Amino acid sequence: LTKIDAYAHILPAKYYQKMLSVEPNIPNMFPFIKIKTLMDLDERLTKWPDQNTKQVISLANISPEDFTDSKTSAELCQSANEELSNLVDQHPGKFAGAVAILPMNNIESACKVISSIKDDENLVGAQIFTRHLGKSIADKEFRPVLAQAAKLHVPLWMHPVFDARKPDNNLVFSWEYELSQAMLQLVQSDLFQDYPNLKILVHHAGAMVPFFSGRIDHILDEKHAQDFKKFYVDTAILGNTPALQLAIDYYGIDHVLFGTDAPFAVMPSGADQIITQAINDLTISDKDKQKIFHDNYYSLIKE
């Protein structure tokens, strides 16, 4: 037993410095640059939250697709993935694996990224967002990428982004609504009808689905209602034992993975402590806790 934090975030120094050359106004546009452990690898390693934790690292949301053309974005993402792969290789007692960035403005190249994940031990999946370039993840534009991941058995990490079209976006509730929207949009566009074996890991314990499963069941038909159960979820809800229990009740124990949203929310290095405590406070077996902390991650990434 060792704890695998399946959803932690990083900004690798060379990629970050490449993205500053693309737009030097980025430290103004993105407030989370302040967090030292996101930016500074030695800071992260020094103030490491638990010695019994390894992290699965993915890029924080400064994606090249939002700043450059299709070709330059593909080059920047390949470079970022290479750097991410190196970080796991170089620090294998700290990083369990890395989640690759996709150039969603370059569909051909994004498909190549999915294919390259099988060829690299350090790259463990790819990260998708609830919206790419102002379109839903469920948009036909990105469906080939999702189809490729299903075909090759690559697990996808799904992350929220603010929808700028919606007024009153905030850090409290908007991202969770965005996660729920995206799942609904994927489900109703027949994603799991076409690809039942596709694995998506959803940030923040499946967002609004466990609490409002009663609605899903009564609004959607049988096949689509049950398709919401195909998602895997992390535990990144900052504690909350009974909410994590509700998530297990809906998804089953094998779909719930330890995840923290590190280094965010808890300074300096994320919420490893409060989340670990909340999983430990669950009235479930030790086998079940080991699945959450450890086993479910390895089931997810099996190829």
Q: How far is the CB of 172 from its own copies (least distance, A)?
A: 5
Q: Between residues 123 and 271, which has the closer beta carbon with respect to Na ion? A: 123
Q: Which of 261, 275, 291, 295 binds Zn ion (CB under 5 A)?
A: 261
- Rounded to whole angstroms, the Cα distance separating 92 from 112 reads 25
Stretch 107-146: interaction string toward its own copies, x if CB under 8 A: -----------------------------x----------
Is residue 215 near its own copies by the rule CB under 8 A? yes
Positive or negative: CA dihedral 249, 251, 254, 260? negative
Residue list for the binding site for Zn(2+): 9, 159, 203, 261
Is residue 246 near its own copies by the rule CB under 8 A? yes
Return the range that interacts with its own copies (CB under 8 A); candidates 51-59, 86-94, 152-160, 233-241: 233-241
Total residues at interface with Zn ion (CB under 5 A): 1
Q: Which of 26, 107, 220, 282 binds its own copies (CB under 8 A)?
A: 220
Q: Report which residue type is found at 61.
A: N
CB 86 within 8 A of CB 155: no
Return the range that interacts with its own copies (CB under 8 A); candidates 89-97, 106-114, 152-160, 178-186: 178-186
Return the range that interacts with Zn ion (CB under 5 A); candidates 27-35, 80-88, 139-147, 256-264: 256-264
Return the range that interacts with Na ion (CB under 5 A); candidates 106-114, 115-123, 127-135, 164-172: 115-123
Is residue 214 near its own copies by the rule CB under 8 A? yes
21-80 positions binding its own copies, by CB under 8 A: none
Query: Which residues of this chain interact with its own copies, rule CB under 8 A?
Result: 136, 163, 165-168, 170-173, 176-177, 180-181, 184-185, 204-205, 208, 210-220, 237-240, 242-243, 245-246, 249, 265-266, 271, 274
